[PDB]
Design a protein around this ligand. Structure first.
Ligand SMILES: CC1(C)CC(=O)c2c(C(F)(F)F)nn(-c3ccc(C(N)=O)c(N[C@H]4CC[C@H](O)CC4)c3)c2C1
Length: 208
């Protein structure tokens, strides 16, 4: 397990998201599903010139898995997944420009629901989550586990749990006062009003 510091701009963005009073928190799910949809676009597009990239799984879908007892909401896709370089450097590098630009806008008057147009929608997960775990598998790399409870640091480590084949699992350890996002009626309402035009099956896993 390696520990890394966030870039100052990203760390600043996370502090803002965690400690700003913002009631329209449900937008986190639209942003995470948009991330999955982009990941699925990319693997499908690349498979058009190299069909062997789908040997790790041909189905392209998004699963939403709430867990009331663990107080976790998990978003699973079979998209392209992320490499070690993605998790530690490349995505952060791209995010720096959008993050800084996003924090300017937050002072021009723009509100938090706009985070998506800056390419940094993933970090909206910290509106509802005290800790975020990302399990991801790219065709050209091993399975890795990313985790952060904000505070300016994050960890990456090789994962040894069950293999995923290919794709990304985002595990939101929900805050105490945010368990409404574990209710199936609530999840269905958010999906239908923010993400009804996603080009892949979105499946809600009902708890038994
Ligand atoms: C690396 C992170 C842990 C922290 C991060 O900063 C970040 C960001 C960023 F804010 F930079 F935009 N985005 N982001 C993230 C999170 C889930 C996914 C998905 N569900 O696959 C994702 N998709 C691909 C889509 C196609 C791209 O070619 C590569 C990514 C990206 C993360 C996860």
């Amino acid at each position: 397990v390696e520990t890394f510091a966030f870039q100052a701009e990203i760390a600043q963005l996370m502090s803002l998201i965690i400690n700003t009073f913002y009631s329209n928190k449900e937008i986190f799910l639209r942003e995470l599903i948009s991330n999955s949809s982009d990941a699925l676009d990319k693997i499908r597009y690349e498979s058009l010139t190299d069909p062997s990239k789908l040997d790790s799984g041909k189905e392209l879908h998004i699963n939403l898995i709430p867990n009331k007892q663990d107080r976790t909401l998990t978003i699973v896709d079979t998209g392209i997944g992320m490499t070690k370089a993605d998790l530690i450097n490349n995505l952060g590098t791209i995010a720096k420009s959008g993050t800084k630009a996003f924090m300017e806008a937050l002072q021009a008057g723009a509100d938090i629901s706009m985070i998506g147009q800056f390419g940094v929608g993933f970090y909206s997960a910290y509106l509802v989550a005290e800790k975020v775990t990302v399990i991801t598998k790219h065709n050209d790399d091993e399975q890795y586990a990313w985790e952060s409870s904000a505070g300016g640091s994050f960890t990456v480590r090789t994962d040894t749990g069950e293999p995923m084949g290919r794709g990304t699992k985002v595990i939101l350890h929900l805050k105490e006062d945010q368990t409404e996002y574990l209710e199936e009626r609530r999840i269905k309402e958010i999906v239908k009003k923010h993400s009804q035009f996603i080009g892949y099956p979105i499946t809600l896993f009902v708890e038994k």
